[PDB]
Design a protein around this motif. Structure first.
Motif, PDB file in Angstrom:
ATOM      1  N   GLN A   1      -5.330   0.531  -5.584  1.00 14.76           N
ATOM      2  CA  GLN A   1      -4.273   0.244  -4.625  1.00 14.76           C
ATOM      3  C   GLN A   1      -2.954   0.037  -5.355  1.00 14.76           C
ATOM      4  O   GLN A   1      -2.881  -0.749  -6.306  1.00 14.76           O
ATOM      5  CB  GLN A   1      -4.618  -0.999  -3.800  1.00 14.76           C
TER       6      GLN A   1
ATOM      7  N   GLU B   1       1.214   7.964   4.711  1.00 17.37           N
ATOM      8  CA  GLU B   1       1.288   7.573   6.116  1.00 17.37           C
ATOM      9  C   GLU B   1       2.042   6.260   6.296  1.00 17.37           C
ATOM     10  O   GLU B   1       2.706   6.072   7.320  1.00 17.37           O
ATOM     11  CB  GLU B   1      -0.110   7.500   6.746  1.00 17.37           C
TER      12      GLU B   1
ATOM     13  N   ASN C   1       0.868  -1.176   0.000  1.00 18.75           N
ATOM     14  CA  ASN C   1       0.000   0.000   0.000  1.00 18.75           C
ATOM     15  C   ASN C   1       0.906   1.227   0.000  1.00 18.75           C
ATOM     16  O   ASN C   1       1.357   1.665   1.063  1.00 18.75           O
ATOM     17  CB  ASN C   1      -0.934  -0.009   1.203  1.00 18.75           C
TER      18      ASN C   1
END
Ligand code: NAG
Ligand code: NAG
Ligand code: NAG
Ligand code: NAG
Ligand code: NAG
Ligand code: NAG
Lengths: 50, 596, 99
Positions: B322, B39, B35
């Protein structure tokens, strides 16, 4: 409990049905030392330490 | 009480507090790779900084225990691994400069975009924009343009960076009681304290030259054959007496010759062993590919994959929404967590890659019983070699017929074995002189044998002498032609591929002798053999606890890396190339006779 | 990560059977006195378990219950269930009523 502070429960003055535990499919280890599981449901003991 | 018991308790505390932290860091890296989100990048950077600071504090605690008062070999090995300063011996300004240089080289290599002058409105990145052009084009000046423009931009950006890099790494290595950074890289194969099985850092270069002197006739015959075929493909550019032009080798750098198989095929009229259409006709999913690989590993006697492997791995491309890294990677995250991150297609290459990465997973699972800091390969060559032996065994026509992927009436004559062996030589034999020349050049750069104003004059001289490849036009010292490759620009050792290639065929001969195969070595399949799997798993379970020389004694019965299994593997091809090179001239001239 | 489970990692001697150690005193592995602070050669003996659901089966948490059966000279009162055969009347049978 944690293994350093393992809980000990004293089991007295009742009927201990071990076939409920032995015939369960939820347990991975049921290794008995010094006694066989088949005669546990027959024999009688003074106290049980869990 | 004693120093050894203190070190043992400290190592227990270390393994305990470094296992959960390594699992958190590895899980953050996994969440970044499956991913790509900002973050996850931040979590990866935080986990990596915590891991590096914890390793710094544990090395600082570890150095206070002197090495010579410990007699147990495993404890001494873990203390030797932990007590390395790394960059910590260097000053904080120079360490920060080195880290900044490494990060900016990573950004320059990853985000390097090059296109033609006077047409700048859109440009192509290295993967896959330049890779497809280098692997599939047949035009001389287009490949010349791409090669020279990418080495112009990348080398002119990276040359002062590499000049700073060599000085900083040499300073860190001599601060760490090494001769140079090359000695630091050669210290991976250093074995000290074992009677008879000791291996020195200086013995590695001598062993590499000794093996390469036996490599050289096979590579000379292969180079002559490839030269004749490229002369047929490109009529006037290639000279009969000179070296090969650099941009015609099928890859960007000359790392592999496997993209020249179409041009240099012996018998094009005969069929291939391609099994792609058979899987498309039977609708083989990537899950079926990994289950067949698991069936292969249980057939040899190795353990099967965990439940967490099947639950937690990503074996298919997730989708448009994704983002994930497409490179196939096996992850040993720690605490018994083993995963494969591969965007698996229905191809032969992805099937062999699945076998290779599941071999990596089997190697990682085998040393799970070892202590945490010993959970690695015995050297850097074994870890890749145990995947490459699975790539060897799975690619055989016997394995394809056994699993039903190939027709049982497929005719295995000598011509298909010759062209298969030539494809394996273009993949395997062709990378050996490039690897040896690159590592020897880097060792001479770190040792100070080559001054900074003479790096490239020697380098092309080495390439003509060793690889037999000539530069299209001369390059001055404004270029940085080595650092256009991924491993050298990002501080990676490169001798692991040479050692992997030799260990691959040594392990192949050992397992085929274990499996009692009675034919040619390239016709050998290690399935159905419990004893071969047991002989493999005896070395696999050790990890880094034992020396690599003792592990090689455990597998092949030899105390040193050997070149004879490679020559035995390609011996039909060697005789065929000697037959085909009667009219042509074997060997090359280092002069500028083709083009400069 | 479930870190609610600690184990004792170091002790000077092995435990006796059915012993519980809940002491949190600093283990002294070296000659230097710890002085109650976890520094160098002095470690806190209780360490936490890291339990994640994606761990392997050799690292996943296992709940263990050990039942200890002892016979002492006192009358044994924890007995098993005494299976009772249905009662049959008016026939010559072998009866066992409460021993
Ligand atoms: C990947 O990240 C996005 C954004 O954070 C999130 O919505 C998505 O669920 C993630 N994918 C998986 C498989 O967790
Ligand atoms: C070395 O230490 C390991 C554990 O750290 C132990 O199992 C092994 O027996 C030791 N070897 C010797 C020779 O004492
Ligand atoms: C690490 O650096 C320190 C500080 O100079 C030094 O005392 C120590 O010997 C170094 N360790 C090794 C293994 O070189
Ligand atoms: C691995 O093999 C064992 C033993 O045959 C079996 O019980 C287990 O289910 C297998 N695991 C998988 C994921 O198939
Ligand atoms: C294969 O064998 C046949 C007969 O032995 C021979 O004529 C042919 O040249 C061989 N081909 C190769 C490539 O060796
Ligand atoms: C290996 O074992 C499997 C399972 O029994 C079998 O299907 C396969 O044919 C065997 N391989 C060979 C070459 O006989």
């Amino acid at each position: 409990a944690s293994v350093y502070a393992w809980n000990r429960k004293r089991i007295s003055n009742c009927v201990a049905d071990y076939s409920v535990l032995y015939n369960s499919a939820s347990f991975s280890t049921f290794k008995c030392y010094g006694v066989s599981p088949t005669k546990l449901n027959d024999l009688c003991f003074t106290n049980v330490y869990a | 009480s004693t120093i050894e018991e203190q070190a043992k308790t400290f190592l227990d505390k270390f393994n305990h507090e470094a296992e959960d932290l390594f699992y958190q860091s590895s899980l953050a890296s996994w969440n970044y790779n499956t991913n790509i989100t900002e973050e996850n990048v931040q979590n990866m950077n935080n986990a990596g900084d915590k891991w590096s600071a914890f390793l710094k504090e544990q090395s600082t605690l570890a150095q206070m225990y002197p090495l010579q008062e410990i007699q147990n070999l495993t404890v001494k090995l873990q203390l030797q691994a932990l007590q390395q300063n790394g960059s910590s011996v260097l000053s904080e300004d120079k360490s920060k400069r080195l880290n900044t240089i490494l990060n900016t080289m990573s950004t320059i290599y990853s985000t390097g975009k090059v296109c033609n002058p006077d047409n700048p409105q859109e440009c192509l990145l290295l993967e896959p924009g330049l890779n497809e052009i280098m692997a599939n084009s047949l035009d001389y000046n287009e490949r010349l343009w791409a090669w020279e423009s990418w080495r112009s931009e990348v080398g002119k950006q990276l040359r002062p960076l590499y000049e700073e890099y060599v000085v900083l790494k040499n300073e860190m290595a001599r601060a760490n009681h090494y001769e140079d950074y090359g000695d630091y890289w050669r210290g991976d194969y250093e074995v000290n304290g074992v009677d008879g099985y000791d291996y020195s850092r200086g013995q590695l270069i001598e062993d590499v030259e000794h093996t390469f002197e036996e490599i050289k006739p096979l590579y000379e015959h292969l180079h002559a054959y490839v030269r004749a075929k490229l002369m047929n493909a490109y009529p006037s550019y290639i000279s009969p007496i000179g070296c090969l032009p650099a941009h015609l080798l099928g890859d960007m750098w000359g790392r592999f010759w496997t993209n020249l198989y179409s041009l240099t095929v012996p018998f094009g009229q005969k069929p291939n062993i391609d099994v792609t259409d058979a899987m498309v006709d039977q609708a083989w999913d990537a899950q079926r590919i990994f289950k067949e690989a698991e069936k292969f590993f249980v057939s040899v006697g190795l353990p099967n994959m965990t439940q967490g492997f099947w639950e937690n791995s990503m074996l298919t491309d997730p989708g448009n929404v994704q983002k994930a890294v497409c490179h196939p990677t096996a992850w040993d995250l720690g605490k018994g967590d083993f995963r494969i991150l591969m965007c698996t297609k229905v191809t032969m290459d992805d099937f062999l890659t699945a076998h290779h990465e599941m071999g990596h997973i089997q190697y990682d699972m085998a040393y799970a019983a070892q202590p945490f800091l010993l959970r690695n390969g015995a050297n850097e060559g074994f870890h890749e070699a145990v995947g490459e032996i699975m790539s060897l065994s799975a690619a055989t026509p016997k394995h394809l017929k056994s699993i039903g992927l190939l027709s049982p009436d497929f005719q295995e004559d000598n011509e298909t074995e010759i062209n298969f062996l030539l494809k394996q030589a273009l993949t395997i034999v062709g990378t050996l002189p490039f690897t040896y020349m690159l590592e020897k050049w880097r060792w001479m750069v770190f040792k100070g044998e080559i001054p900074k104003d003479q790096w490239m004059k020697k380098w092309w001289e080495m390439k003509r002498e060793i690889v037999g490849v000539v530069e299209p036009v001369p390059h001055d010292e404004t270029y940085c032609d080595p650092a256009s490759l991924f491993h050298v620009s990002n501080d990676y050792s490169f001798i692991r591929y040479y050692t992997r290639t030799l260990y691959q065929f040594q392990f192949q001969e050992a397992l085929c002798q274990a499996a009692k195969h009675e034919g040619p070595l390239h016709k050998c399949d290690i399935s159905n053999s419990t004893e071969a799997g047991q002989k493999l798993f005896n070395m696999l379970r050790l990890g880094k606890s034992e020396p690599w020389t003792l592990a090689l004694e455990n597998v092949v019965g030899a105390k040193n890396m050997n070149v004879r299994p490679l020559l035995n593997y390609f011996e039909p091809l060697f005789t065929w190339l000697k037959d085909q090179n009667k009219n042509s001239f074997v060997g090359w001239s280092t002069d500028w006779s083709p083009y400069a | 990560g479930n870190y609610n489970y600690r184990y004792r990692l170091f002790r000077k001697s092995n435990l006796k059977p059915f012993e519980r150690d809940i002491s949190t005193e600093i283990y002294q592995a070296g000659s230097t006195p710890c002085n109650g602070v976890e520094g160098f050669n002095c470690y806190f003996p209780l360490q936490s378990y890291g339990f994640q659901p994606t761990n392997g089966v050799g690292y996943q948490p296992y709940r263990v219950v050990v039942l200890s059966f002892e016979l002492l000279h006192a009358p044994a009162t924890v007995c098993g269930p005494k299976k009772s055969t249905n009662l049959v009347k008016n026939k010559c049978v072998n009866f066992n009523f409460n021993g």
